[PDB]
Amino acid sequence: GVDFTESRLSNLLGIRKRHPFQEGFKIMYEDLEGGNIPALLDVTAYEESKK
């Protein structure tokens, strides 16, 4: 994950806590729910495929 607590770069990354006054503020794989990258599709496999 990634914790900013001890830093400001957060503000640069245009990302900020919504109650900007505490510390539950670290970001773990576990928080970005649904936000998994899709995965990407294979192009060539699609192509050659005309059997």
Partner 1 sequence: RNSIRYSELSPLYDTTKLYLVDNKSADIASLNYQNDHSNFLTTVVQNNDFT
Binding residues: 19
Amino acid at 12: L
Select from 1, 14, 20, 24 the one that contacts partner 1 (CB under 8 A): 20
Size of the site for partner 1 (CB under 8 A): 5
Residue 5 in contact with residue 26, Cβ under 8 Å? Answer: yes
Instruction: Report the sign of the C-alpha dihedral through residues 20, 26, 27, 31, in that order.
Output: negative
Binding residues for Zn(2+): 19
Is the Cβ of residue 21 or residue 46 nearer to partner 1 in the bound state? 21
Q: Which residues bind partner 1 (CB under 8 A)?
A: 18-22
